[PDB]
Structure formats: structure tokens, C-alpha cells
Amino acid sequence: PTIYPVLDWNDIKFQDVIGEGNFGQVLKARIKKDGLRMDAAIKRMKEYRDFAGELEVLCKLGHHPNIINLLGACEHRGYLYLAIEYAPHGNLLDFLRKSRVLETDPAFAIANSTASTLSSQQLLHFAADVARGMDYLSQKQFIHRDLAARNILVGENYVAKIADFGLSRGQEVYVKKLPVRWMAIESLNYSVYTTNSDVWSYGVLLWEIVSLGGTPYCGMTCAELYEKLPQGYRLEKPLNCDDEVYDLMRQCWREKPYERPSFAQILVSLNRMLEERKTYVNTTLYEKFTYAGIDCSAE
């Protein structure tokens, strides 16, 4: 199990400690690649198996613009220093919340009649980016298990990249025991995960993008969700969301796993909306605009 290229320890310069989705805490650094010094992040992995397992999965990732790519690795004093892409703009949840200009800078907001520094086109492109990345991953048998805005990074040129550390690979995976608010009914009931359940999570993630980082089911407790979701209860349509975007969300939450669209179909739907001049996710103030709640007591 070897991840290339092989990086030389003395070419690595550590600059800070940061978080990067499911990679957890990583070292912001500068490495040498193809003769050039570049930004990167480094995930330190203790080799002392549980290690060999997550390394075999990481080697099956391959490359894709919408995932966090592996840049190389360096073995040093018993630990594997895995270099990965650095995301200059942090995670998507934080990015979405920092765009609520009506709260961060109301003057600019009023002056520009806007509720966000992000346009409807940009928000849908984020959704498209994740769907494109998940199509790539699921096609290769990957099962994410924790798909949500917090696990999506906004990288170079604002391209959304899926955090891909510790993923599963296969037809289905059972994980005993939690991101209850993103979990599909079958996961809540039997702790099983499939690409079909990843699609349910994607629906909630799309809901996060549309609501500009709002907390899913803000107000309801985890206990309430286990009870109501199986009865047919579903997240409500954000007030700035077009009917077509919400219906896409609803398709992702159908009770029958096999009836949910595939990530490829989701991307087709997203691209059709992006091609038209019509606004699908409103960010214009007009005469009234409401920011979705953020219950930090659930985070």
C-alpha cells in the first residue's frame, strides 16, 4: 500500500493546524511537487490493521476535480504524512453562513438588495459539484456515510470538493454507533449505509446550500426525528427555494431506497436549471427575506 508521489520530509514546511472535513485536524503546509513549491494540507497517520484498511481505501480514490485529491505521502518516524489538497476557503457550511451579508454587513446587503454574497448560479454550481463528485465516487463503489456541508470543502477557484477520508467501499456497510439529521430512514433503523442512503444525505446537503447553512430540522430533537421521519415527515421547502429544487430534494428522501435518483440523474437535473436564465435559489431581498435558523444547541 503506497501512495505516490513519494515526498521528501525536508521539502515539507508546516505552517498551521486546521480542520478539513472528515480528515479531522490536518497540518496546513507547503510541499514540493513537480519541481514547484505549493500549498497543501497534511494528515498525519499513526501506522501502529486499522491503518492498512483506510490506506487501501484511500488508494482506490483516483483523481477527480470534485473530491479532495491525494498529492503524495511521506513516511517519517513511524507515521505516514499524507499530503492532500488545501482548500483556501474552508468548509462549505462555514462558507454558506459567512455569505449571509444581511447579518455580516447589512449596509452592503441593503445597498445591493441582497441576502447573500453568493448568487443562485453559484449555489447551484456547489450542488452540481458535489453531485458530480459523488457520481464519480459511487461509480467506484464508495459509500460516504456522512455527506453534509461540513464535509464539503470550497477549494481553488471556489470548486467544491468532497472530504474523502475514512470512506467505505462495497455494496452496503453496517456501522453500529451521530449525524442523525442527514441519515436516511434505513440508516436510522438498521445502521446500514449504501449509495442510496448517500443520496438521501445529499438531499439534506442541497437543503443546506439552499437555506444558506441552516440547521436541518432546526428545533426538532433527534428523538423526534426517529419517530416522525418513518411516518412520512420531511424537511419543509425553504422560503427562497423554487418548486423544482425542492422536488429534487423530495426525490432524494423517498422511503424506498431504490426509488431515489442516482447522482448522475441529480447532476442532469441540476445542469438543466443552470442552463436557464431563471433564478432557482433566491437571494434577492425584494420585500421580505428570512434566514433559516441555526440551532448551535444541535451542533
Side-chain angles (χ1 to χ4, degrees), residues 1-45 47 50-176 178-276 278-296 298-299:
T2 307
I3 297 181
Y4 312 76
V6 172
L7 306 174
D8 174 58
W9 180 258
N10 293 301
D11 285 316
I12 302 175
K13 178 180 185 173
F14 303 109
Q15 323 174 84
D16 202 348
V17 170
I18 63 172
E20 188 164 335
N22 51 202
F23 279 93
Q25 296 280 276
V26 292
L27 294 156
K28 180 172 180 297
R30 294 224 90 201
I31 65 179
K32 186 178 185 174
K33 189 178 186 181
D34 303 313
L36 305 170
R37 304 292 300 170
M38 71 178 281
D39 289 330
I42 295 187
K43 171 59 171 176
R44 184 166 178 270
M45 293 171 77
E47 298 182 297
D50 186 302
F51 168 73
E54 62 204 332
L55 188 63
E56 180 194 299
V57 181
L58 290 174
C59 286
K60 305 296 186 185
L61 289 175
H63 286 288
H64 190 278
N66 297 126
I67 66 171
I68 288 293
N69 293 289
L70 306 197
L71 300 176
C74 173
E75 168 59 54
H76 190 266
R77 305 185 66 183
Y79 296 79
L80 175 65
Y81 289 75
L82 183 64
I84 63 180
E85 289 183 296
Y86 167 62
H89 310 291
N91 72 75
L92 182 59
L93 184 58
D94 180 61
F95 197 67
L96 291 170
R97 292 177 172 175
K98 288 183 182 300
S99 79
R100 292 184 175 194
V101 64
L102 194 53
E103 283 181 346
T104 68
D105 178 17
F108 173 87
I110 294 300
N112 291 288
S113 303
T114 189
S116 180
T117 49
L118 297 171
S119 76
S120 178
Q121 280 284 133
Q122 291 174 304
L123 292 173
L124 287 186
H125 273 301
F126 278 150
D129 280 346
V130 183
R132 192 180 305 101
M134 280 309 296
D135 173 58
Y136 171 77
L137 292 171
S138 61
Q139 290 291 57
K140 303 218 295 175
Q141 306 294 297
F142 285 89
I143 298 173
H144 196 283
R145 303 196 318 281
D146 190 17
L147 206 46
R150 60 175 170 278
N151 275 326
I152 299 304
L153 296 125
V154 182
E156 303 199 345
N157 299 95
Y158 303 86
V159 174
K161 292 165 174 291
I162 303 170
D164 47 13
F165 185 80
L167 307 193
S168 291
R169 200 157 174 291
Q171 198 192 202
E172 181 176 63
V173 58
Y174 161 83
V175 183
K176 196 175 185 178
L178 211 63
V180 175
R181 314 174 99 82
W182 283 263
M183 292 169 55
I185 285 180
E186 62 265 32
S187 296
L188 293 170
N189 289 339
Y190 313 112
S191 304
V192 292
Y193 301 81
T194 67
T195 59
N196 277 323
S197 66
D198 274 341
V199 162
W200 172 298
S201 299
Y202 177 83
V204 185
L205 170 33
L206 176 53
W207 189 93
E208 292 185 86
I209 289 175
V210 173
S211 69
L212 301 171
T215 301
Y217 312 104
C218 191
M220 298 175 77
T221 67
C222 291
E224 288 185 288
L225 294 177
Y226 279 83
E227 174 178 60
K228 288 183 161 56
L229 293 178
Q231 296 174 177
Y233 182 95
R234 296 292 187 274
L235 285 164
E236 293 150 69
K237 188 182 79 171
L239 300 176
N240 64 319
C241 188
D242 185 83
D243 288 328
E244 201 185 337
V245 180
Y246 186 61
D247 293 318
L248 182 43
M249 285 180 206
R250 297 300 297 254
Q251 303 176 199
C252 298
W253 309 321
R254 287 160 176 166
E255 178 162 286
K256 295 176 185 176
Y258 46 89
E259 297 193 306
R260 300 170 195 160
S262 62
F263 282 113
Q265 295 175 308
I266 291 174
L267 182 59
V268 165
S269 296
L270 289 171
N271 286 329
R272 316 244 266 203
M273 293 183 274
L274 279 171
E275 300 287 53
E276 314 180 317
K278 183 179 179 179
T279 289
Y280 284 91
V281 184
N282 181 59
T283 59
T284 298
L285 296 179
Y286 292 122
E287 294 184 57
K288 185 176 183 180
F289 193 102
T290 314
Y291 275 158
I294 293 175
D295 185 63
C296 294
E299 291 173 45

